Every structure is written in C-alpha cells, then in structure tokens.
PDB file of C-alpha atoms in Angstrom:
ATOM      1  CA  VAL A   2     199.448 107.207 101.904  1.00  0.00           C
ATOM      2  CA  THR A   3     202.675 107.765 103.887  1.00  0.00           C
ATOM      3  CA  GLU A   4     203.481 106.940 107.525  1.00  0.00           C
ATOM      4  CA  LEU A   5     200.386 105.559 109.226  1.00  0.00           C
ATOM      5  CA  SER A   6     200.402 103.881 112.613  1.00  0.00           C
ATOM      6  CA  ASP A   7     198.943 100.400 112.731  1.00  0.00           C
ATOM      7  CA  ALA A   8     195.987 102.168 114.326  1.00  0.00           C
ATOM      8  CA  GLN A   9     195.639 104.660 111.470  1.00  0.00           C
ATOM      9  CA  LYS A  10     196.029 101.983 108.775  1.00  0.00           C
ATOM     10  CA  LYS A  11     193.009 100.200 110.309  1.00  0.00           C
ATOM     11  CA  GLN A  12     190.660 103.170 110.620  1.00  0.00           C
ATOM     12  CA  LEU A  13     191.366 104.146 107.036  1.00  0.00           C
ATOM     13  CA  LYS A  14     190.684 100.733 105.506  1.00  0.00           C
ATOM     14  CA  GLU A  15     187.443 100.575 107.499  1.00  0.00           C
ATOM     15  CA  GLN A  16     186.305 103.988 106.297  1.00  0.00           C
ATOM     16  CA  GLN A  17     187.261 103.144 102.719  1.00  0.00           C
ATOM     17  CA  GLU A  18     185.744  99.663 102.484  1.00  0.00           C
ATOM     18  CA  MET A  19     182.616 101.115 104.108  1.00  0.00           C
ATOM     19  CA  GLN A  20     182.471 103.892 101.540  1.00  0.00           C
ATOM     20  CA  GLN A  21     182.989 101.665  98.510  1.00  0.00           C
ATOM     21  CA  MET A  22     180.279  99.348  99.895  1.00  0.00           C
ATOM     22  CA  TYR A  23     177.910 102.335  99.874  1.00  0.00           C
ATOM     23  CA  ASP A  24     179.080 103.407  96.412  1.00  0.00           C
ATOM     24  CA  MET A  25     178.532  99.926  94.983  1.00  0.00           C
ATOM     25  CA  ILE A  26     175.014  99.985  96.429  1.00  0.00           C
ATOM     26  CA  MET A  27     174.247 103.341  94.790  1.00  0.00           C
ATOM     27  CA  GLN A  28     175.757 102.384  91.449  1.00  0.00           C
ATOM     28  CA  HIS A  29     173.807  99.107  91.412  1.00  0.00           C
ATOM     29  CA  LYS A  30     170.667 100.930  92.485  1.00  0.00           C
ATOM     30  CA  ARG A  31     171.293 103.451  89.709  1.00  0.00           C
ATOM     31  CA  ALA A  32     172.035 100.788  87.073  1.00  0.00           C
ATOM     32  CA  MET A  33     168.654  99.168  87.755  1.00  0.00           C
ATOM     33  CA  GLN A  34     166.877 102.514  87.326  1.00  0.00           C
ATOM     34  CA  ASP A  35     168.602 102.726  83.951  1.00  0.00           C
ATOM     35  CA  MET A  36     167.180  99.354  82.829  1.00  0.00           C
ATOM     36  CA  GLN A  37     163.725 100.309  84.131  1.00  0.00           C
ATOM     37  CA  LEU A  38     163.585 103.478  82.031  1.00  0.00           C
ATOM     38  CA  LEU A  39     164.611 101.470  78.952  1.00  0.00           C
ATOM     39  CA  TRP A  40     161.914  98.894  79.492  1.00  0.00           C
ATOM     40  CA  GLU A  41     159.432 101.691  80.183  1.00  0.00           C
ATOM     41  CA  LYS A  42     160.054 103.182  76.746  1.00  0.00           C
ATOM     42  CA  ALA A  43     160.501  99.784  75.089  1.00  0.00           C
ATOM     43  CA  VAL A  44     156.780  99.317  75.734  1.00  0.00           C
ATOM     44  CA  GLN A  45     156.219 102.996  74.690  1.00  0.00           C
ATOM     45  CA  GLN A  46     157.125 101.531  71.360  1.00  0.00           C
ATOM     46  CA  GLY A  62     158.837  91.142  70.928  1.00  0.00           C
ATOM     47  CA  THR A  63     162.477  90.416  71.776  1.00  0.00           C
ATOM     48  CA  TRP A  64     163.506  93.852  73.070  1.00  0.00           C
ATOM     49  CA  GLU A  65     162.196  92.732  76.460  1.00  0.00           C
ATOM     50  CA  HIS A  66     164.175  89.486  76.187  1.00  0.00           C
ATOM     51  CA  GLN A  67     167.537  91.216  75.871  1.00  0.00           C
ATOM     52  CA  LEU A  68     166.664  93.887  78.422  1.00  0.00           C
ATOM     53  CA  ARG A  69     166.054  91.084  80.895  1.00  0.00           C
ATOM     54  CA  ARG A  70     169.182  89.225  79.818  1.00  0.00           C
ATOM     55  CA  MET A  71     171.213  92.414  80.161  1.00  0.00           C
ATOM     56  CA  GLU A  72     169.680  93.116  83.564  1.00  0.00           C
ATOM     57  CA  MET A  73     170.573  89.546  84.523  1.00  0.00           C
ATOM     58  CA  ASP A  74     174.220  90.212  83.562  1.00  0.00           C
ATOM     59  CA  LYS A  75     174.301  93.369  85.650  1.00  0.00           C
ATOM     60  CA  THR A  76     172.931  91.574  88.695  1.00  0.00           C
ATOM     61  CA  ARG A  77     175.572  88.847  88.375  1.00  0.00           C
ATOM     62  CA  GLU A  78     178.415  91.329  88.294  1.00  0.00           C
ATOM     63  CA  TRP A  79     176.797  93.104  91.226  1.00  0.00           C
ATOM     64  CA  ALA A  80     176.859  89.723  92.977  1.00  0.00           C
ATOM     65  CA  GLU A  81     180.454  89.076  91.878  1.00  0.00           C
ATOM     66  CA  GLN A  82     181.446  92.444  93.325  1.00  0.00           C
ATOM     67  CA  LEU A  83     179.762  91.531  96.606  1.00  0.00           C
ATOM     68  CA  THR A  84     181.716  88.313  97.069  1.00  0.00           C
ATOM     69  CA  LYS A  85     185.094  90.093  96.947  1.00  0.00           C
ATOM     70  CA  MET A  86     184.031  92.431  99.743  1.00  0.00           C
ATOM     71  CA  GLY A  87     184.091  89.449 102.144  1.00  0.00           C
ATOM     72  CA  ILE A  93     178.542  84.343 102.357  1.00  0.00           C
ATOM     73  CA  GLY A  94     176.933  81.586 104.337  1.00  0.00           C
ATOM     74  CA  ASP A  95     176.901  84.278 107.013  1.00  0.00           C
ATOM     75  CA  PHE A  96     173.537  85.530 105.722  1.00  0.00           C
ATOM     76  CA  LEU A  97     171.543  82.534 104.484  1.00  0.00           C
ATOM     77  CA  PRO A  98     170.144  79.331 105.978  1.00  0.00           C
ATOM     78  CA  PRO A  99     171.324  76.193 104.128  1.00  0.00           C
ATOM     79  CA  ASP A 100     168.168  75.638 102.044  1.00  0.00           C
ATOM     80  CA  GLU A 101     168.335  79.164 100.631  1.00  0.00           C
ATOM     81  CA  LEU A 102     172.136  79.056 100.108  1.00  0.00           C
ATOM     82  CA  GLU A 103     172.148  76.264  97.530  1.00  0.00           C
ATOM     83  CA  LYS A 104     169.182  77.713  95.637  1.00  0.00           C
ATOM     84  CA  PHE A 105     171.286  80.868  95.804  1.00  0.00           C
ATOM     85  CA  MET A 106     174.417  79.239  94.424  1.00  0.00           C
ATOM     86  CA  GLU A 107     172.517  77.378  91.721  1.00  0.00           C
ATOM     87  CA  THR A 108     171.203  80.629  90.239  1.00  0.00           C
ATOM     88  CA  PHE A 109     174.542  82.405  90.639  1.00  0.00           C
ATOM     89  CA  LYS A 110     176.182  79.489  88.837  1.00  0.00           C
ATOM     90  CA  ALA A 111     173.531  79.575  86.090  1.00  0.00           C
ATOM     91  CA  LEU A 112     173.987  83.291  85.483  1.00  0.00           C
ATOM     92  CA  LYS A 113     177.738  82.801  85.581  1.00  0.00           C
ATOM     93  CA  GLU A 114     177.500  80.171  82.796  1.00  0.00           C
ATOM     94  CA  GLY A 115     175.356  82.364  80.517  1.00  0.00           C
ATOM     95  CA  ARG A 116     172.170  80.345  81.005  1.00  0.00           C
ATOM     96  CA  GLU A 117     168.938  82.158  81.865  1.00  0.00           C
ATOM     97  CA  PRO A 118     167.363  80.942  85.175  1.00  0.00           C
ATOM     98  CA  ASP A 119     163.684  80.670  86.032  1.00  0.00           C
ATOM     99  CA  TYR A 120     162.277  84.155  86.155  1.00  0.00           C
ATOM    100  CA  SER A 121     161.042  83.875  89.720  1.00  0.00           C
ATOM    101  CA  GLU A 122     164.250  82.246  90.917  1.00  0.00           C
ATOM    102  CA  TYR A 123     166.254  85.030  89.306  1.00  0.00           C
ATOM    103  CA  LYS A 124     164.007  87.584  91.017  1.00  0.00           C
ATOM    104  CA  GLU A 125     164.500  85.805  94.321  1.00  0.00           C
ATOM    105  CA  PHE A 126     168.202  86.189  93.554  1.00  0.00           C
ATOM    106  CA  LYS A 127     168.175  89.865  92.581  1.00  0.00           C
ATOM    107  CA  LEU A 128     166.459  90.677  95.870  1.00  0.00           C
ATOM    108  CA  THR A 129     168.823  88.505  97.857  1.00  0.00           C
ATOM    109  CA  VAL A 130     172.051  90.127  96.709  1.00  0.00           C
ATOM    110  CA  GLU A 131     170.367  93.493  97.259  1.00  0.00           C
ATOM    111  CA  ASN A 132     169.419  92.254 100.731  1.00  0.00           C
ATOM    112  CA  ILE A 133     172.855  90.886 101.594  1.00  0.00           C
ATOM    113  CA  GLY A 134     174.440  94.101 100.306  1.00  0.00           C
ATOM    114  CA  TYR A 135     172.393  96.207 102.709  1.00  0.00           C
ATOM    115  CA  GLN A 136     173.160  93.771 105.504  1.00  0.00           C
ATOM    116  CA  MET A 137     176.900  94.057 104.847  1.00  0.00           C
ATOM    117  CA  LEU A 138     176.763  97.837 104.831  1.00  0.00           C
ATOM    118  CA  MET A 139     174.789  98.021 108.048  1.00  0.00           C
ATOM    119  CA  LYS A 140     177.283  95.652 109.709  1.00  0.00           C
ATOM    120  CA  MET A 141     179.980  98.288 109.015  1.00  0.00           C
ATOM    121  CA  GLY A 142     178.152 101.497 109.957  1.00  0.00           C
ATOM    122  CA  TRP A 143     176.990  99.702 113.113  1.00  0.00           C
TER     123      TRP A 143
ATOM    124  CA  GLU B   4     169.180 124.055 126.648  1.00  0.00           C
ATOM    125  CA  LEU B   5     170.255 122.872 123.203  1.00  0.00           C
ATOM    126  CA  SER B   6     170.506 124.877 119.957  1.00  0.00           C
ATOM    127  CA  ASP B   7     168.199 124.057 117.005  1.00  0.00           C
ATOM    128  CA  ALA B   8     171.265 122.502 115.435  1.00  0.00           C
ATOM    129  CA  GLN B   9     171.831 120.356 118.505  1.00  0.00           C
ATOM    130  CA  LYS B  10     168.129 119.632 119.120  1.00  0.00           C
ATOM    131  CA  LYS B  11     167.644 118.244 115.595  1.00  0.00           C
ATOM    132  CA  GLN B  12     170.928 116.303 115.628  1.00  0.00           C
ATOM    133  CA  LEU B  13     169.678 113.942 118.350  1.00  0.00           C
ATOM    134  CA  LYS B  14     166.173 113.509 117.059  1.00  0.00           C
ATOM    135  CA  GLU B  15     167.845 112.550 113.807  1.00  0.00           C
ATOM    136  CA  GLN B  16     170.252 110.309 115.756  1.00  0.00           C
ATOM    137  CA  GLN B  17     167.466 108.940 117.968  1.00  0.00           C
ATOM    138  CA  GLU B  18     165.326 108.164 114.932  1.00  0.00           C
ATOM    139  CA  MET B  19     168.209 106.368 113.205  1.00  0.00           C
ATOM    140  CA  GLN B  20     168.783 104.187 116.267  1.00  0.00           C
ATOM    141  CA  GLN B  21     165.012 103.932 116.761  1.00  0.00           C
ATOM    142  CA  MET B  22     164.642 101.971 113.544  1.00  0.00           C
ATOM    143  CA  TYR B  23     168.016 100.226 113.364  1.00  0.00           C
ATOM    144  CA  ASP B  24     166.898  98.561 116.576  1.00  0.00           C
ATOM    145  CA  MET B  25     163.539  98.009 114.949  1.00  0.00           C
ATOM    146  CA  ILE B  26     165.291  96.095 112.156  1.00  0.00           C
ATOM    147  CA  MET B  27     167.506  93.851 114.312  1.00  0.00           C
ATOM    148  CA  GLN B  28     164.486  92.939 116.422  1.00  0.00           C
ATOM    149  CA  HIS B  29     162.535  91.819 113.369  1.00  0.00           C
ATOM    150  CA  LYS B  30     165.706  90.216 112.012  1.00  0.00           C
ATOM    151  CA  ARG B  31     166.194  88.044 115.090  1.00  0.00           C
ATOM    152  CA  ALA B  32     162.517  87.030 115.160  1.00  0.00           C
ATOM    153  CA  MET B  33     162.916  85.599 111.656  1.00  0.00           C
ATOM    154  CA  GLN B  34     166.097  83.809 112.743  1.00  0.00           C
ATOM    155  CA  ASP B  35     164.029  82.416 115.626  1.00  0.00           C
ATOM    156  CA  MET B  36     161.169  81.119 113.509  1.00  0.00           C
ATOM    157  CA  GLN B  37     163.539  79.656 110.934  1.00  0.00           C
ATOM    158  CA  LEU B  38     165.260  77.489 113.547  1.00  0.00           C
ATOM    159  CA  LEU B  39     161.949  76.289 114.985  1.00  0.00           C
ATOM    160  CA  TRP B  40     160.862  75.559 111.420  1.00  0.00           C
ATOM    161  CA  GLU B  41     164.176  73.780 110.806  1.00  0.00           C
ATOM    162  CA  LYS B  42     163.837  71.331 113.698  1.00  0.00           C
ATOM    163  CA  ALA B  43     160.133  71.084 112.767  1.00  0.00           C
ATOM    164  CA  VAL B  44     161.116  69.449 109.457  1.00  0.00           C
ATOM    165  CA  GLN B  45     163.923  67.421 111.059  1.00  0.00           C
ATOM    166  CA  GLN B  46     161.658  65.276 113.223  1.00  0.00           C
ATOM    167  CA  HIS B  47     159.037  64.444 110.612  1.00  0.00           C
ATOM    168  CA  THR B  63     151.508  69.889 110.044  1.00  0.00           C
ATOM    169  CA  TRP B  64     153.692  71.585 112.680  1.00  0.00           C
ATOM    170  CA  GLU B  65     155.873  72.744 109.770  1.00  0.00           C
ATOM    171  CA  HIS B  66     152.852  74.625 108.481  1.00  0.00           C
ATOM    172  CA  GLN B  67     151.622  76.870 111.296  1.00  0.00           C
ATOM    173  CA  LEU B  68     155.340  77.570 111.685  1.00  0.00           C
ATOM    174  CA  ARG B  69     155.333  78.908 108.129  1.00  0.00           C
ATOM    175  CA  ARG B  70     151.963  80.505 108.902  1.00  0.00           C
ATOM    176  CA  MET B  71     152.939  82.637 111.893  1.00  0.00           C
ATOM    177  CA  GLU B  72     156.219  83.490 110.250  1.00  0.00           C
ATOM    178  CA  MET B  73     154.126  84.954 107.428  1.00  0.00           C
ATOM    179  CA  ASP B  74     151.963  86.662 110.023  1.00  0.00           C
ATOM    180  CA  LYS B  75     154.959  88.489 111.489  1.00  0.00           C
ATOM    181  CA  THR B  76     156.360  89.689 108.199  1.00  0.00           C
ATOM    182  CA  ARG B  77     152.888  91.130 107.495  1.00  0.00           C
ATOM    183  CA  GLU B  78     153.327  92.823 110.900  1.00  0.00           C
ATOM    184  CA  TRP B  79     156.803  94.141 110.039  1.00  0.00           C
ATOM    185  CA  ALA B  80     155.361  95.609 106.849  1.00  0.00           C
ATOM    186  CA  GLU B  81     152.483  97.108 108.846  1.00  0.00           C
ATOM    187  CA  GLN B  82     155.026  98.699 111.183  1.00  0.00           C
ATOM    188  CA  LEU B  83     157.307 100.121 108.500  1.00  0.00           C
ATOM    189  CA  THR B  84     154.418 101.762 106.622  1.00  0.00           C
ATOM    190  CA  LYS B  85     153.371 103.764 109.712  1.00  0.00           C
ATOM    191  CA  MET B  86     156.692 105.651 109.535  1.00  0.00           C
ATOM    192  CA  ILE B  93     156.124 103.569  99.989  1.00  0.00           C
ATOM    193  CA  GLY B  94     155.685 103.705  96.289  1.00  0.00           C
ATOM    194  CA  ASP B  95     158.968 105.612  96.767  1.00  0.00           C
ATOM    195  CA  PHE B  96     160.771 102.242  96.396  1.00  0.00           C
ATOM    196  CA  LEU B  97     158.884 100.237  93.743  1.00  0.00           C
ATOM    197  CA  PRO B  98     158.005 100.884  90.100  1.00  0.00           C
ATOM    198  CA  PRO B  99     154.260 100.490  89.547  1.00  0.00           C
ATOM    199  CA  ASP B 100     154.592  96.915  88.235  1.00  0.00           C
ATOM    200  CA  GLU B 101     156.445  95.677  91.312  1.00  0.00           C
ATOM    201  CA  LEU B 102     154.213  97.928  93.418  1.00  0.00           C
ATOM    202  CA  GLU B 103     150.930  96.207  92.700  1.00  0.00           C
ATOM    203  CA  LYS B 104     152.147  92.610  93.030  1.00  0.00           C
ATOM    204  CA  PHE B 105     153.363  93.892  96.385  1.00  0.00           C
ATOM    205  CA  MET B 106     149.982  95.264  97.419  1.00  0.00           C
ATOM    206  CA  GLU B 107     147.983  92.195  96.360  1.00  0.00           C
ATOM    207  CA  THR B 108     150.098  89.905  98.503  1.00  0.00           C
ATOM    208  CA  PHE B 109     150.001  92.414 101.364  1.00  0.00           C
ATOM    209  CA  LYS B 110     146.213  92.249 101.109  1.00  0.00           C
ATOM    210  CA  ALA B 111     146.062  88.449 101.005  1.00  0.00           C
ATOM    211  CA  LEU B 112     147.998  88.121 104.252  1.00  0.00           C
ATOM    212  CA  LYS B 113     145.752  90.767 105.825  1.00  0.00           C
ATOM    213  CA  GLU B 114     142.802  88.523 104.904  1.00  0.00           C
ATOM    214  CA  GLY B 115     144.259  85.237 106.118  1.00  0.00           C
ATOM    215  CA  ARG B 116     144.882  83.953 102.631  1.00  0.00           C
ATOM    216  CA  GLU B 117     148.079  82.044 101.781  1.00  0.00           C
ATOM    217  CA  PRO B 118     149.975  83.124  98.651  1.00  0.00           C
ATOM    218  CA  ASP B 119     152.036  80.676  96.716  1.00  0.00           C
ATOM    219  CA  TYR B 120     155.454  80.328  98.266  1.00  0.00           C
ATOM    220  CA  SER B 121     157.444  82.301  95.693  1.00  0.00           C
ATOM    221  CA  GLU B 122     154.969  85.174  95.880  1.00  0.00           C
ATOM    222  CA  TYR B 123     155.423  85.275  99.649  1.00  0.00           C
ATOM    223  CA  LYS B 124     159.204  84.998  99.267  1.00  0.00           C
ATOM    224  CA  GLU B 125     159.394  88.014  96.954  1.00  0.00           C
ATOM    225  CA  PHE B 126     157.244  89.832  99.492  1.00  0.00           C
ATOM    226  CA  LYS B 127     159.393  89.030 102.541  1.00  0.00           C
ATOM    227  CA  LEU B 128     162.554  90.049 100.701  1.00  0.00           C
ATOM    228  CA  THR B 129     161.044  93.260  99.354  1.00  0.00           C
ATOM    229  CA  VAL B 130     159.877  94.617 102.717  1.00  0.00           C
ATOM    230  CA  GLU B 131     163.241  93.615 104.147  1.00  0.00           C
ATOM    231  CA  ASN B 132     164.970  95.677 101.478  1.00  0.00           C
ATOM    232  CA  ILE B 133     162.578  98.563 102.001  1.00  0.00           C
ATOM    233  CA  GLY B 134     163.502  98.726 105.681  1.00  0.00           C
ATOM    234  CA  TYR B 135     167.198  98.602 104.823  1.00  0.00           C
ATOM    235  CA  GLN B 136     166.709 101.445 102.330  1.00  0.00           C
ATOM    236  CA  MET B 137     165.079 103.930 104.676  1.00  0.00           C
ATOM    237  CA  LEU B 138     167.661 103.269 107.406  1.00  0.00           C
ATOM    238  CA  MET B 139     170.095 104.394 104.747  1.00  0.00           C
ATOM    239  CA  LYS B 140     168.404 107.675 103.846  1.00  0.00           C
ATOM    240  CA  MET B 141     168.704 108.501 107.545  1.00  0.00           C
ATOM    241  CA  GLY B 142     172.316 107.384 107.927  1.00  0.00           C
ATOM    242  CA  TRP B 143     173.658 108.921 104.736  1.00  0.00           C
TER     243      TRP B 143
END
C-alpha cells in the first residue's frame, strides 16, 4: 500500500495483526471441530484413535508455532512455563507426550491465544 | 431519546465491557493467589489452603459465568467438566490435573463468550 504516514502505517499493522490473530483462532477452532467429527464417526465404526490423536497433536503444535511468531513468559508463572516448554519440545521432536500433559498444553495455547487477542481489542 | 439502533448499541457495548471487566477482575485474583502461593512455598500446610481457596474462587468464577454451556464442549469433555464442578461444590478435592483442566477450561469459556460479543 502506497504513501502512508507513519501514523497510518501503525494503525494498519495493528488492524491487520489483530485480524489475523482472530482468523488464526477461528481456523484452529475449526480444525479441532474437524478432528472431533472424525473421531465421532471413527467410533461409529483400534489404532484409528491413535493416529487421530497424533494428528490432532500435530495440529496443536503448529497452532502453537503460529502463536510464537505473533509476539511468551508474559502469560505463565515459571512452574507452568517449563512444563509448557517441555511438552512443546516433545511435540516438536515427534514424540507423544503424556495425554494429560498434552491436554494441559492444548488448553494453554488456546488460553494464551485468547489472551493475546483481547490485549489487542482492548 | 435514543433510537432502537442506538439503544441496543450501548447495551451491547455495556455488556461487552461488563464482562471484559469481569474477566480482568478474576484474572488479577488468580495472579494474586499465585504470588501468595509462590512465597508460601519459598519459606518452607499454608501452601494447601492457598491451593484450596484458589480452587474455591475458580468454582466461583464458573458459578458466575454460568448465570449469564454445553455450547463449548463436546459431550465427553462436558461430563468430566461437570463432575469436577460438582466435587468443588461439595468440598471435595480433585486430583491436581483434573482441577488444572477445569481451571483452564472455564478460563477459555469466558474468553470465548467475550468474543461472540466483540465480533
């Protein structure tokens, strides 16, 4: 976009990085609905549920990896940050964390995402 | 004297702010009880009632959101939610991870409805 004042350049980047933050939230939200439906019919039929969960785990990592390039210690106390980074690391290296630690992690990126959004729209 | 259009704009706006504020207030009360719990485990149980009344405020947050819910959880996640909501209502103590997944879920539920209003 052409000849923007330093003012205008700033209001546009704010509006745009706020909108893509929203979009990323809706596309992650939507992705998870997609996996849910597949599980829900997978039972409407052994290892199906293992790869569904492993695929869901891959989606949540890339959701997390998206989140980091929008900005992380901002949002967590120290105890929860290293548990956080252990899981992230584990998912990043293709190993499959403990199912309740992964669920703690899914919810925490979701949570941080919403917190980032609301710190833009307010 | 405001139009319908105008009259409903503010009550929308007021209700958005009404619960944004409601979120920050609960948010800062968790930040408060974390810090007290932090220095409670520095010196050394005092750690425990600190966990206990933290739990008893998240159960209050939940209680306050619901007054304004299966709209956010598939039935699997929904029942694990309701069991652990019940246990805190009855002074039980769920195992830590169960309570964690509960605190995070209600937090996300509050974030979600503030969004339906704002977007």
